[PDB]
């Protein structure tokens, strides 16, 4: 019985490029300084993207883990733990982007001969940042399927990093399941002209997905059903489209079928890849996790358009997140969310943005399914208002004086370590943030003290059929949220 049980761990994301495109750890001295400053603040750990485009660049199964081993070594020396992301997606590539790392060139070479390995929009544009879920089990990559690539990659990682895993440095494995490493479709690509708060576009037009859907509708008794042709374009508003307008196609039988099939692909995609993750890190003292995208625009209108095109079939009469949480259950994985710092009043009224409500829904759905939920801030913020909102979401019902809190997130990762953050005035408030997150307790080196002891990863539990998974779509009332935290940074 002690306040320490209200302790929520805080991690800081490392900047991009720590390890460059040439697989070189370019600035150990500069990073060490920064890591030590993070120690002065009592930060628990850091998060780093382990880029597939950097590691398996040479060719199939030709991995080079040295640079990352050096990075891990430095982190361990500075006394911090680490969350490793298996990033099977592109980095940068947009005008102005400094850190640009596409997926392996040998995979792109295959893409030149088979354009359908990339997510595709209705106009036929190919998004080269990730491999379409449609080729998860297609053995077209020099004999391997997309999932086998991800599987061998994670297996190589565990073996070559066996020492860091056994010494307790690497404490979390976040499996990237799509663009930006999120489990979703690239519905709002900056490269194709999208601009907030556009509804975005469906990305199921590649030959593979377009064939599965057609077989699906045929089995449903409607062979003639086609992929959406009235959903408009990236920057449209819901009401201007035949698909999302009131009494539009989205509440139609065919529309509902399509949306169900569309969102279903994401559930199977994540479930199958997580199967490989459990096998790869079996026995290791590490937790598994995935990242869910926070599509807060249009959440306040009945059609939830942005979410739908992203692949989250979430409406006011259909929960599109609780099923994801349920799917994570058998893998004992953490649902890592975002938008933890946003307040509705900060978004433009024309965006119908409901980040606060989205967070409350996702988190409640996770706790309802009895899985752990973690999260990050969506955008760089250095003010007390952002921190207090994060702290609120961390322990939505406040702290329990002599016992664990009624509700609490498993941990939060702060967006990007940067010169701005380390700036004295900004770092001063950030430090108050860590203190409150830690419930006024000093940094605690042994997670066991606040009930975060990590045990050997167990095999994933029996597969759960899609019907049982979809039972979670039943709407539920969210847990009650406090209007403001009881533990705010005095600022």
Residue where the block lists tokens 């358009």? 305
Sign for the CA dihedral angle at 231, 233, 234, 240 comes to negative
Instruction: Please choose, from the candidates 153, 122, 147, the residue with its C-alpha nearest in 3D space to the C-alpha of residue 134.
Output: 147
The Cα diameter of the chain in Å comes to 65
- Alpha helices, DSSP H only, in 297-344? 305-310, 322-329
Residue with the two structure tokens 């120690």: 39
Say what angle helices 207-219 and 253-280 make with each other, to 10 degrees: 120
Determine whether 226 is an active site residue.
no
Q: Is 115 annotated as a binding residue?
A: no
Q: How far apart are CA 186 and CA 164, in angstroms?
A: 33
Say whether 222 counts as a known binding-site residue. no
Q: Is the dihedral of CA 132, 137, 140, 141 positive or negative?
A: positive
Distance of CA 357 to the CA centre of its chain: 18
Q: What is the Cα–Cα distance from 200 to 452, expressed in whole angstroms?
A: 39
- CA end-to-end distance (rounded Å), the chain: 30
Q: Determine whether the annotation assigns residue 330 to a binding site.
A: no
Cβ pair 56, 104 in contact under 8 A: yes
Sequence-ordered list of residues with C-beta below 8 angstroms from that of 29, at least 6 positions apart, any chain: none
| Alpha-carbon distances of 486 from 85, 228, 359, 489, rounded to whole Å | 32, 47, 19, 10
Residue 97 in marked binding region: yes
Ramachandran assignment for 28, one of left (phi > 0), alpha (psi -120 to 50 degrees), beta (any other): alpha
Does 49 belong to an annotated binding site? yes
List the catalytic residue out of 129, 182, 307, 341: 182
Question: CA of 160: how far to CAs of 104, 196, 212, 301, in Å?
Answer: 20, 41, 38, 49
Residue 91, helix vs strand vs coil: strand
Q: Supply the DSSP string of 172-221, one letter for each residue.
A: EEEE--SGGG-SS---S-GGGT--TT--------SHHHHHHHHHHHHHTT
Pick the catalytic residue from 174, 341, 369, 376.
376
**Exposure string over 189-204, b if 16+ CB within 10 A, otherwise e:** beeeebeebbbbbbbb
User: Does the annotation flag 343 for ligand binding?
Assistant: no
- Concerning whether 182 is annotated as a catalytic residue, the answer is yes
Closest by CA to 153, choosing from 250, 81, 242, 84, is 84
Angstrom distance (rounded) from CA 473 to CA 264 = 12
DSSP-derived secondary structure letter, 244: T
- The reply to whether 291 sits in an annotated binding site is yes
The pairing of beta strand 126-131 with beta strand 118-120: antiparallel
Is 416 annotated as ligand-binding? Answer: yes
- Residues annotated within the binding site for substrate are 49, 89, 97, 291, 296, 338, 377-378, 416
- Residues annotated within the binding site are 49, 89, 97, 291, 296, 338, 377-378, 416
Question: So which residues are the catalytic ones?
Answer: 182, 376
């Amino acid at each position: 019985s002690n306040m320490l049980l209200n302790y929520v761990p805080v991690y800081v994301m490392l900047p991009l490029g720590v390890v460059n495109v040439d697989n070189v750890f370019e600035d150990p001295d500069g990073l060490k300084e920064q890591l030590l400053q993070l120690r002065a603040a009592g930060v628990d750990g850091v998060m780093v993207d382990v880029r597939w485009g950097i590691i398996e660049l040479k060719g199939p199964k030709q991995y080079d883990w040295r640079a990352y081993r050096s990075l891990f070594q430095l982190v361990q020396e500075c006394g911090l733990t680490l969350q490793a992301i298996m990033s099977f997606h592109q980095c940068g590539g947009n005008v102005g982007d400094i850190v640009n790392i596409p997926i392996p060139q040998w995979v792109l070479d295959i893409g030149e001969s088979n354009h359908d390995i990339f997510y595709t929009n209705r106009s036929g544009t190919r998004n080269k940042e990730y491999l379409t879920v449609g080729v998860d089990n297609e053995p077209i990559f020099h004999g391997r399927t997309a999932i086998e690539i991800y599987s061998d990659y994670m297996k190589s990682f565990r073996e070559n990093m066996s020492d860091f895993l056994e010494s307790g440095l690497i404490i979390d494995i976040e499996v990237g399941l799509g663009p930006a490493g999120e489990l979703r479709y690239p519905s709002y690509p900056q490269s194709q002209g999208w601009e907030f708060p556009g509804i975005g576009e469906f990305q199921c037009y590649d030959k593979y997905l377009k064939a599965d859907f057609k077989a699906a509708v045929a089995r449903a008794g409607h062979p003639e059903w086609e992929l959406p042709d009235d959903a408009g374009k990236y920057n449209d508003v819901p009401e201007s489209t035949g698909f999302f307008k009131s009494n539009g196609t989205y509440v139609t039988e065919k529309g509902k079928f399509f949306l169900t099939w569309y969102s279903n692909k994401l559930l199977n995609h994540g479930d199958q890849i997580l199967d490989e993750a459990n096998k790869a890190f079996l026995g290791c003292k590490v937790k598994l996790a995935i990242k869910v995208s926070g599509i807060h625009w249009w959440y306040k209108v009945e059609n939830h358009a942005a979410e739908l095109t992203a692949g989250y079939y979430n409406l006011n009469d259909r929960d599109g997140y609780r099923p994801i949480a349920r799917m994570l259950s058998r893998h004992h994985a953490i649902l890592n969310f975002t938008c933890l710092e946003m307040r509705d009043s900060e978004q433009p009224s024309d965006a119908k943005s409901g980040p606060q409500e989205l967070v409350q829904q996702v988190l409640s759905g996770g706790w309802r399914e009895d899985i752990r939920v973690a999260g990050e801030n969506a955008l760089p913020r250095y003010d007390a208002t952002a921190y207090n909102q994060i702290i609120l979401n961390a322990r939505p019902q406040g702290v329990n004086n002599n016992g664990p809190p009624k509700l609490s997130m498993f941990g939060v990762t702060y967006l990007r370590l940067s010169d701005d953050l380390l700036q004295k005035s900004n770092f001063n408030i950030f430090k108050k943030f860590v203190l409150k997150m830690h419930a006024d307790q000093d940094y605690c080196a042994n997670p066991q003290k606040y009930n975060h002891a990590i045990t050997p990863l167990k095999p994933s539990a029996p597969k759960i059929p899609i019907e049982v998974l979809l039972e979670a779509t039943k709407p539920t009332l969210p847990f009650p949220w406090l209007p403001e935290t009881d533990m705010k940074v005095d600022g």
